[PDB]
Structure formats: structure tokens, C-alpha cells
């Protein structure tokens, strides 16, 4: 059973209670983007990340309580049609915005209950070839190797691993692609506690997460609770959600400035992760994340196929 989050008087997490951290409701985001929440009927803006006004070039007083009809006149009708009440929470509306103050932005929206969650961040054949390369891989080891090399080629990440969960939830690096000079993790195994049970559960439902800068302080949502419910805003489906500080510290101690993983899901179970590191902070472009999501699904399919052959 989850502890209350920090903003509802819950404890700071320690190694005795890793599994009790409510990582899905941190009430805060990473500073490389901005987040709004809005009422799913009216489009009234209900919450904003503290950086949202500055990030979007709006007056703080003007942004709170404004409507999406007024803020996003060109997207609001399409957004409503795309995300009706009761639609799957995983369903997304995506648009590219020409925003003079911030530049070209990627807008990603999903619905949870009666709330729309809007994520804004900057945005800037390969997919076909990568997809084909995974399919054409001859066995599981080769598939793992191709997956890591292909993801590294697409992303530029310093390290890309295939991290496989054992039945006891320990993990092992079973393939990696790595920059010259980096220590090998191939064949190394790690305790189950380093990716705790609630993280593993979340990663079965929401298939990509990241920390763009492992030193960056989280930016709170204001108000922190959804005014509709007087309860935490669900952020499991928001890539911008703040990462657990316990994990951020783990990464800093490894010399990792930026981290990203994609779930590999086989028979509805979390089989492993495509796990990526960069030494320097690094925001993987939105279009590249979409490509990785496609490759995660392809790898998942191919792991099942390869495991059936062998």
C-alpha cells in the first residue's frame, strides 16, 4: 500500500520503503517541458506547472483559469473529438504548434477521467529500416544486439542495454551498445529492489519513461491537487512527470545525466527494458521517442517469436 505523496504529508522515501513511493502522482514535472491540466468538458485550465507561463510566454495571471478554446483555438475542436469521456487513458491526441515565444512545440494530450493532461515540449525511412532489422534478426541474442545497436544509432545515446527480468524480478544486462571507454555491464545482474514492484507495475501500463537531466529539480504543479477531485493528478501517462528522487540519485552515482527506457511486454508481462543512458543531460526529440515506442512494440513481438523458435 502506497504512502501518501510528499505534498499530502507523506514521508521522504528511504531504502526500507522503496516500493511504497507513489511514483505515478509526484505533483511535479521535469523542467524541459510544461504541463497544463484542463477540464475535459469546458477546457478551463485547472493546473499549471510553475514554469508553464514562462515556458509558453504567457502572463501567470492570464494562464490560470483560461480556456483551451482561447489558448489553443486551432486544436481545441480536434482535441475534444479525439479524446471523449471514457476513452482509454492510453489514447493520445498529438499536434505540432508554431509558438513564437517557445518555437515549434510538440503537444501531447491524454484524458484521465474528466481531466485532460497537456504536455508541451520543443520539437525539431529510418523507422522502416529499423523495424525490418529487428524482424530479420535470426535468434534472440542477435535480436537483442540489433535492438541495442539500432536504438543507439537512432538516438545517439552513450549506452543502450537490453535489461531482462528474471522470475524473481532481478535484472540482467543481456546485450548492450556503448560508447568507447564506458565500462561493460554485459552479464551483470542487479537486485529486484532497484526497479521496485510499483515501478514494474506502472511500466506494464505506460511503456516509456525518462529523466532528461538527473540533476534538475522537479517543477511543481499549481494547484498541486486536481480541483475537480481534491485529489492527486494521475501522471503515470505523462512523460514529463518527475522521476523518483531515489532513482535520480542512483543515476547520478552512475555518472548518468540522462536516462530513458522502453518496456518490452511479452504475454502481458514485463519481460525487460530497452534501457538508455547519456553522460550529459539530453532531451531525446519527441519524434524520436515515438520511433522508440514503435520499436519497443516490434521488439516485444519479436522476442515472443524468437522465444517460440528456440
Ligand X SMILES: *C/C=C1/C(=C/c2[nH]c(/C=C3[NH+]=C(/C=C4\NC(=O)C(C=C)=C4C)C(C)=C\3CCC(=O)O)c(CCC(=O)O)c2C)NC(=O)[C@H]1C
Annotation: binding site: 18
The whole-angstrom separation of Cα 298 and Cα 302 is: 6
Are 22 and 10 in contact, with CB atoms under 8 Å apart?
A: yes
**111 vs 159, which CB is nearer to ligand X?**
159
Size of the site for ligand X (CB under 6 A): 25
Q: Is the dihedral of CA 88, 288, 253, 183 positive or negative?
A: positive
User: Binding to ligand X by residue 155, rule CB under 6 A?
Assistant: no
User: Binding to ligand X by residue 3, rule CB under 6 A?
Assistant: no
Closest distance to ligand X from the beta carbon of 185 (Å):
5
User: Binding to ligand X by residue 146, rule CB under 6 A?
Assistant: no
3-state secondary structure of 15: coil
What are the angstrom distances between the C-alpha of 74 and each of 80, 95, 97, 105, 305?
A: 12, 10, 9, 14, 44
**3 vs 250, which CB is nearer to ligand X?**
250
Are 230 and 242 in contact, with CB atoms under 8 Å apart?
A: no
Q: Is the dihedral of CA 87, 104, 152, 133 positive or negative?
A: positive
What are the angstrom distances between the C-alpha of 89 and each of 27, 115, 206, 236?
A: 18, 10, 10, 10
Which residues 13-42 are close enough to bind ligand X by CB under 6 A?
A: 15, 18, 21, 23
Closest distance to ligand X from the beta carbon of 254 (Å):
7
**71 vs 274, which CB is nearer to ligand X?**
274
User: Binding to ligand X by residue 2, rule CB under 6 A?
Assistant: no
How many Cβ atoms are within 10 Å of 245's Cβ, its own excluded?
15
User: Binding to ligand X by residue 244, rule CB under 6 A?
Assistant: yes
Which residues 190-219 are close enough to bind ligand X by CB under 6 A?
A: 190, 193-196, 199, 209, 211
Among 273, 283, 295, 303, binds ligand X (CB under 6 A): 273
User: Binding to ligand X by residue 259, rule CB under 6 A?
Assistant: yes
User: Binding to ligand X by residue 275, rule CB under 6 A?
Assistant: yes
Window contacting ligand X (CB under 6 A); options: 76-84, 229-237, 239-247, 278-286? 239-247
Closest distance to ligand X from the beta carbon of 280 (Å):
15
User: Binding to ligand X by residue 261, rule CB under 6 A?
Assistant: yes
The alpha carbon of 43 is separated from its chain's Cα centroid by a whole number of angstroms, namely 24
What are the angstrom distances between the C-alpha of 123 and each of 106, 108, 118, 120?
A: 6, 12, 15, 9
Q: Residue for cell digits 483559469?
A: 65
Give the interface with ligand X as residue ranges (CB under 6 A). 15, 18, 21, 23, 171, 173, 185, 190, 193-196, 199, 209, 211, 243-244, 246-247, 250, 259-261, 273, 275
Amino acid at each position: 500500500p502506497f504512502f501518501p505523496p510528499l505534498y499530502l504529508g507523506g514521508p521522504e522515501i528511504t531504502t526500507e520503503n522503496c516500493e511504497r513511493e507513489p511514483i505515478h502522482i509526484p505533483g511535479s514535472i521535469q523542467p524541459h517541458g510544461a504541463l497544463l491540466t484542463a477540464d475535459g468538458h469546458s477546457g478551463e485550465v485547472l493546473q499549471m506547472s510553475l514554469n508553464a507561463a514562462t515556458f509558453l510566454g504567457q502572463e501567470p495571471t492570464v494562464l490560470r483559469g483560461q480556456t483551451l478554446a482561447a489558448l489553443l483555438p486551432e486544436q481545441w475542436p480536434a482535441l475534444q473529438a479525439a479524446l471523449p469521456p471514457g476513452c482509454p487513458d492510453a489514447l493520445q491526441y498529438r499536434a505540432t504548434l508554431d509558438w513564437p515565444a517557445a518555437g515549434h512545440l510538440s503537444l501531447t494530450v491524454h484524458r484521465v477521467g474528466e481531466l485532460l493532461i497537456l504536455e508541451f515540449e520543443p520539437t525539431e525511412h529510418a523507422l522502416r529500416n529499423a523495424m525490418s532489422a529487428l524482424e530479420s534478426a535470426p535468434n534472440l541474442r542477435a535480436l537483442a544486439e540489433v535492438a541495442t545497436q539500432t536504438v543507439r544509432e537512432l538516438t545517439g545515446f552513450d549506452r543502450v542495454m537490453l535489461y531482462k527480468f528474471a522470475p524473481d524480478a532481478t535484472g540482467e544486462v543481456i546485450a548492450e551498445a556503448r560508447r568507447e571507454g564506458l565500462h561493460a555491464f554485459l552479464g551483470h545482474r542487479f537486485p529486484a529492489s532497484l526497479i521496485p514492484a510499483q515501478a514494474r507495475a506502472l511500466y506494464t501500463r505506460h511503456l516509456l519513461r525518462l529523466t532528461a537531466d538527473t540533476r534538475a529539480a522537479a517543477v511543481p504543479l499549481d494547484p498541486v491537487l486536481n480541483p475537480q477531485t481534491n485529489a492527486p493528478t494521475p501522471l503515470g501517462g505523462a512523460v514529463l512527470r518527475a522521476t523518483s528522487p531515489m532513482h535520480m540519485q542512483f543515476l547520478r552515482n552512475m555518472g548518468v545525466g540522462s536516462s530513458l527506457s522502453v518496456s518490452v511486454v511479452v504475454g502481458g508481462q514485463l519481460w525487460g527494458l530497452i534501457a538508455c543512458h547519456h553522460q550529459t543531460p539530453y532531451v531525446l526529440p519527441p519524434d524520436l521517442r515515438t520511433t522508440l515506442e514503435y520499436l519497443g512494440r516490434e521488439l516485444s513481438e519479436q522476442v515472443q517469436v524468437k522465444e517460440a523458435l528456440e
